[PDB]
Amino acid sequence: SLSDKDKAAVRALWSKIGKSADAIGNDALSRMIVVYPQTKTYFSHWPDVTPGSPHIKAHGKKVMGGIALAVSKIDDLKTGLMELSEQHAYKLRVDPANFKILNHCILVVISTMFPKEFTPEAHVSLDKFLSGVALALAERYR
Amino acid sequence: SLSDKDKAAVRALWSKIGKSADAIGNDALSRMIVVYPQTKTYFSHWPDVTPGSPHIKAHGKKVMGGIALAVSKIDDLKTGLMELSEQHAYKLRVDPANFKILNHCILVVISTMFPKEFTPEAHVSLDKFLSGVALALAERYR
Amino acid sequence: VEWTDKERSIISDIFSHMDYDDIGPKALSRCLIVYPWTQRHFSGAIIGNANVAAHGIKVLHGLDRGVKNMDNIAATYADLSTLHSEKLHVDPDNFKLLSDCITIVLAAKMGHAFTAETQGAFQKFLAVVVSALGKQ
Amino acid sequence: VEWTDKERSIISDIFSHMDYDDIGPKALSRCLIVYPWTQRHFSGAIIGNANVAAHGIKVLHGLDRGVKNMDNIAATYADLSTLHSEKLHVDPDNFKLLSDCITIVLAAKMGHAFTAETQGAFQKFLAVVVSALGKQ
Numbered sequence: 434s435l436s437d438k439d440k441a442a443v444r445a446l447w448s449k450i451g452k453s454a455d456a457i458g459n460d461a462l463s464r465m466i467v468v469y470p471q472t473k474t475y476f477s478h479w480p481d482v483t484p485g486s487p488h489i490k491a492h493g494k495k496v497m498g499g500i501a502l503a504v505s506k507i508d509d510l511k512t513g514l515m516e517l518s519e520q521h522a523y524k525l526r527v528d529p530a531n532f533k534i535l536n537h538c539i540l541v542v543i544s545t546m547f548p549k550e551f552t553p554e555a556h557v558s559l560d561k562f563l564s565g566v567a568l569a570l571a572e573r574y575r
Numbered sequence: 576s577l578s579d580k581d582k583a584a585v586r587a588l589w590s591k592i593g594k595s596a597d598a599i600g601n602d603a604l605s606r607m608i609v610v611y612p613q614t615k616t617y618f619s620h621w622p623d624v625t626p627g628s629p630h631i632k633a634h635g636k637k638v639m640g641g642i643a644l645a646v647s648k649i650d651d652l653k654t655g656l657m658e659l660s661e662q663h664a665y666k667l668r669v670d671p672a673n674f675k676i677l678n679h680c681i682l683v684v685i686s687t688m689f690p691k692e693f694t695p696e697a698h699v700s701l702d703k704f705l706s707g708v709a710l711a712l713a714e715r716y717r
Numbered sequence: 718v719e720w721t722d723k724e725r726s727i728i729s730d731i732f733s734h735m736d737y738d739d740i741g742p743k744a745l746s747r748c749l750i751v752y753p754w755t756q757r758h759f760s761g762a763i764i765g766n767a768n769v770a771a772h773g774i775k776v777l778h779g780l781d782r783g784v785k786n787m788d789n790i791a792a793t794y795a796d797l798s799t800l801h802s803e804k805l806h807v808d809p810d811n812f813k814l815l816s817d818c819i820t821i822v823l824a825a826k827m828g829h830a831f832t833a834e835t836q837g838a839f840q841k842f843l844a845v846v847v848s849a850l851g852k853q
Numbered sequence: 854v855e856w857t858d859k860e861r862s863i864i865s866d867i868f869s870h871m872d873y874d875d876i877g878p879k880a881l882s883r884c885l886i887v888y889p890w891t892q893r894h895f896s897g898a899i900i901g902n903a904n905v906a907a908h909g910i911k912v913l914h915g916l917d918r919g920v921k922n923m924d925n926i927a928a929t930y931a932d933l934s935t936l937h938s939e940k941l942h943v944d945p946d947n948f949k950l951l952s953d954c955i956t957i958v959l960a961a962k963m964g965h966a967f968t969a970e971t972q973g974a975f976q977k978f979l980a981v982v983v984s985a986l987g988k989q
């Protein structure tokens with residue numbers, strides 16, 4: 434669970450990368466789909482699912498918007514992401530094993546775009562934060 | 576996180592197997608050490624580390640006592656297991672990846688001893704409970 | 718992977734003494750109940766569902782194939798891998814979960830006969846099969 | 854494992870363009886800081902520690918060995934496996950964690966040149982090496 438040091442580290446990092454949220458979302462989803470083929474099946478209803486695709490570009494914004502929400506509800510992710518959880522579990526039926534995969538792609542993306550900002554001290558708090566998000570999202574599965 | 580249905584399922588199961596706690600602890604630790612060799616290193620200070628060993632028999636009681644404690648602090652594991660966490664992280668320096676391994680051995684043990692009681696409905700709540708214990712124990716690691 | 722002869726013997730013994738029609742349905746049912754998200758691959762209670770039972774039985778006949786080709790496992794499951802992967806869309810993590818339920822159900826049937834050593838050879842066998850199924 | 858030629862080429866390119874003395878120390882340091890429990894294997898700040906650096910460099914020279922024997926990886930690491938396993942007592946999970954840090958550090962150095970395709974071949978290569986090291 435996140436300490437005061439972790440909360441400020443994330444707010445601090447986020448004030449730096451937040452402006453590029455759309456770009457991060459787009460690149461993360463693209464990587465996930467290319468590197469982890471088992472994830473394509475959830476977006477197969479889109480006609481075009483390639484790095485450039487406007488559908489991916491479009492969904493990339495929604496996902497990082499999920500992160501932005503989590504950042505503002507960082508004191509209670511369980512409660513803050515309850516609905517997103519219900520949605521992925523019962524409506525979209527996304528296998529829960531994939532939350533950690535996307536988190537890792539986001540970390541890779543943030544690292545290619547902000548090599549200077551993503552220090553090891555920032556990495557550990559963000560990683561703890563993203564695990565919190567994965568745990569919060571898996572909440573309504575069983 | 577555990578619902579009222581899960582809490583009663585665990586209290587119910589525990590009122591059935593609690594009496595055999597010592598035996599479960601002994602057999603679980605033995606299995607873990609045999610099936611997952613990477614775990615022996617933490618108990619190498621004992622002269623005898625085999626299924627029969629009195630050192631294993633002795634520690635088996637302490638571990639299931641950890642479970643019994645968790646069962647009574649089931650409303651707040653994070654707080655209830657804080658000290659056990661500090662102990663494994665800083666004093667014994669047990670790699671955190673092993674908590675899930677021991678949990679799985681305990682589940683196997685409970686299944687060989689109480690095939691009738693360990694129904695799938697009991698299994699899911701106990702499994703959610705043991706993940707809670709693993710999460711609570713990993714708390715002070717970083 | 719490398720197999721000792723003691724391992725080869727245990728796994729072989731485990732399977733000849735196993736009643737597939739009983740272990741099969743129990744393991745799949747338990748997996749669908751403990752890890753609820755696997756139920757979607759069967760949307761078309763759970764313990765009494767004949768379709769779940771039939772597939773439960775097929776899993777054991779499939780693992781049986783692996784027991785008869787312990788030194789050529791990856792090749793023995795190429796067809797099944799592509800099928801569950803490309804045509805059924807089963808997440809590779811689902812194999813690990815189903816694997817643990819087979820272990821727990823077998824454990825409940827064999828009782829004290831499911832020694833640590835027996836658990837070890839059985840888990841290593843399922844591990845190799847899981848790698849092959851979550852590959853193609 | 855099976856390797857396409859495109860994969861073989863990417864991994865090979867990645868390594869010749871990599872400066873081991875820079876990537877090595879950064880990846881191990883980051884692992885010791887993000888996953889603190891790995892620090893115990895080095896109890897004898899972290900970013901400037903020469904012992905951590907020396908081992909960071911050795912990891913890259915070791916992975917290098919794997920690049921030159923991509924079709925015989927398991928055999929190439931038997932010695933290292935027994936060493937980290939039996940004599941150093943490094944938990945097998947620690948390899949997965951260190952692996953992710955190498956990826957993230959390499960990602961930060963290559964920037965936009967670390968395409969999804971490049972990430973894919975690199976992760977598959979580390980995965981195979983991790984299986985061999987967490988085996989013996």
Ligand code: HEM
Nearest residue numbers: 472475476492495496498499500517525527531532535536
């Ligand atoms: C970083 C964690 C994640 C966050 C914050 C997140 C957030 C969201 C949000 C905000 C929506 C839009 C809700 C709506 O439909 O109105 C959504 C939809 C969706 N998500 Fe996620 N998600 C995450 C991870 C995943 C993963 C790992 C997958 C599967 C590989 C996934 C698959 C989907 C699908 C298929 C949809 C519906 C797509 C569509 O618009 O047609 N999500 N998600």
Ligand code: HEM
Nearest residue numbers: 614617618634637638640641642659667669673674677678
């Ligand atoms: C089911 C989760 C676990 C619980 C509830 C638990 C509980 C305990 C308790 C109550 C103690 C005794 C405290 C004392 O020393 O006064 C202890 C000690 C210890 N635990 Fe754990 N433990 C768990 C998992 C693990 C795992 C997975 C490992 C490593 C494979 C581990 C390794 C140790 C060691 C090495 C000691 C000190 C042994 C000794 O007495 O010399 N524990 N644990």
Ligand code: HEM
Nearest residue numbers: 755758759771772775776779780801805807811812815850
């Ligand atoms: C432990 C390894 C497994 C084995 C050996 C196995 C084996 C099989 C076999 C032999 C078939 C019949 C193929 C055919 O008719 O051509 C099949 C079908 C299928 N499997 Fe699996 N399977 C396994 C795991 C899983 C898992 C974890 C799921 C998802 C919970 C799954 C879902 C399905 C579905 C939906 C079908 C098609 C329906 C049916 O024939 O009953 N399988 N499997």
Ligand code: HEM
Nearest residue numbers: 891894895907908911912915916937941943947948951986
């Ligand atoms: C990613 C794969 C890894 C490779 C290729 C690797 C490689 C090596 C090599 C080549 C040596 C020197 C062996 C000798 O002198 O005979 C070594 C030593 C050692 N490794 Fe690793 N290693 C890896 C991962 C790890 C991890 C994750 C840890 C624990 C955080 C670790 C801890 C050690 C220790 C404590 C030593 C001995 C001290 C030293 O020579 O600096 N290694 N490793």
